[PDB]
Structures are given as structure tokens and as C-alpha cells.
């Protein structure tokens, strides 16, 4: 489906992916014109597995391309490739300008 | 209540807990059959003075939420100020990178 | 706000040197417990910090404003603020949920 629940104007696409696929996902997202990915280091299972959380907040009508493009850049075929979560976002505000909603 | 607003198929459970309680929360969740926990380092400023905490993140179905909450409390509670908080956030969809499977699949 | 919720997470992706200003400004409006982490923007990266705070619905506007005050420089790269609905808040120590759990009760 595409009418995600809860309904929202904006969504966070949160990807937990391999650390070495950072640029591959970033580049692929650039090829569809989406900029402004935020990246942070996380770890799954003192034994851990190093992962990278990639966040980008987008309009509802962009979510499917983003998902597909992250998969494209993140998939290696092996177990440990990660997951992608789609979370509703009520509002986006640009700090510099104070612009809310679509103007942000 | 169990009917959380906003209503969703999945929910993210976010636990900000003491760093030395990582293994205990991880294992307690393991005993109820839950894996896929991811952890990151956070700093609580609530000089450059902070308290070191860890954020523990898991995404589960709506019917798993209460079991996850209680199991994190069990793994993380010491009884002293600074045990942390748990946040429950709606998640619209979950997608496995390797396979493309969405929803419950 | 859509979706409607009792609580909202306010995530602020801002400059690393703006922690104290954002922090202090929030304390003046009665928000004591901000959570901070290292994040990177776009091998070259831009260093930023994610500041996370969960508040009641009626506090969100005031929290957006206060963060802007502490974080705005006027320069390109001031960051963005995201508002996400939070279904429930639980205090680990006591098991308290809802309003009797939102306030940060740690030492200063």
C-alpha cells in the first residue's frame, strides 16, 4: 500500500544499514534529487555489530522512491543487510528561516 | 490502554537507559523471543557537563508493545534516579533490505 | 498536528556548538531534560547534533521557538527540526506512564 497509517504529510525514512554502504545509498538518493541525509553510528548484537542509521524526512509521495533507492544502495544479498522504518512526521521546521511544512 | 493514539501496525520502542544495563535489557528481550535491538550512545544534559546514557531501539508489532515495555523495565530498573525513560512511537511500515519484504512479511 | 497525539518528540538537527544555548533556553521555559547525539550530514561530512525532547502537545510550539532562539546563526547549515508523535512515555524507575512520566527528574 501507499496510504500509510497514521496519515501524515511527512515521514521519516529510517534505515539501519551496513557502514560501508553509506556512500552507495547517499549517491543513489542524489540521483533522484534527494539531499540532506543524516547519518549516525549504531550497533546491534560486550560483542556488537557496527551499523549506520540513515535518516531523511520526506513528503508522503516520496517515500516509495526513497525506500527503493536505499534498498538499491544498501542490498548486498547477505544476512545483516538491515531494515527500513517509515515513521510519521507532524512537522518540519527550517532553523535558519523558520519555514514550516513544504517551504522547508 | 493498549489502543495507542496514533493507531499503527508497528511501533518503535525507544529506551534511554544506563549504559551498563545494555546486556540485561538485551537478554531479557531475548528470553521473550525479541531480537533486532539497536543501541547508540546519547548524552544527557538533562562547563560541558553530561550524563552518558544509551538509546535502545526496537520496532515491533502493536501486540508486542506491552511485553517489550515491561521487559525493558525489568532489564533496566535499578530503582535509583537516572534509570531513564521509554518512548513509544508509531511506525507506518517496516522493510527488510535484503529481501524487500514489508508489513509482517 | 497530524497525526493527533498526547505527546510529541521534537528532534533538532543543529550545529554542535549550539548545545548550551539551546539547552539553557529550554530550561527557562521549564524543559530540563534534553538528549543529545552525534550525527553527520552530507569522504567528507558535516558534523551536527541531534537534540531530542518529548513534550506534551500544548508545549510543541513553544519548544520549536526556544530551540530556534538557541540554535539560529543566520548561516546556511543551521539545521532542521522534526516533530514526531509519541504514543506513550514511561518512567523506567517507577513504571509511571503518561503525564506523571514526561518530566525529567534527574539531578542537575
Curated annotation (Swiss-Prot), chain B:
Top-level taxon in the UniProt lineage: Eukaryota
GO CC, any one term: cytosol
GO biological process, one term: response to sucrose
Annotated binding of ATP, by residue: 44-46, 82-85
Chain sites annotated for binding Mg(2+): 46
One GO molecular-function entry: magnesium ion binding
Induction: By light and sucrose. Down-regulated by treatment with amino acids.
Major location category of this protein: plastid
Effect of disrupting the coding gene: No visible phenotype under normal growth condition, but increased sensitivity to elevated levels of nitrite.
Keywords assigned by UniProt, alphabetized: ATP-binding, Chloroplast, Magnesium, Metal-binding, Nucleotide-binding, Plastid, Transcription, Transcription regulation, Transit peptide
Compartments where found: Plastid, Chloroplast
Functional note: Participates in sensing carbon and organic nitrogen status and regulates some steps of primary carbon and nitrogen metabolism. Required for nitrite uptake in chloroplasts and regulates arginine biosynthesis through interaction with acetylglutamate kinase (NAGK) in chloroplasts. Regulates fatty acids synthesis in chloroplasts by interacting with the acetyl-CoA carboxylase complex and inhibiting acetyl-CoA carboxylase (ACCase) activity.
Quaternary structure and interacting proteins, as annotated: Homodimer. Interacts with NAGK. Interaction with NAGK is dependent of MgATP and inhibited by 2-oxoglutarate, arginine, glutamate, citrate, and oxaloacetate.
Family membership noted in the UniProt record: Belongs to the P(II) protein family.
Record-given protein name: Nitrogen regulatory protein P-II homolog
Organism: Arabidopsis thaliana (Mouse-ear cress)
Taxonomic path: Eukaryota, Viridiplantae, Streptophyta, Embryophyta, Tracheophyta
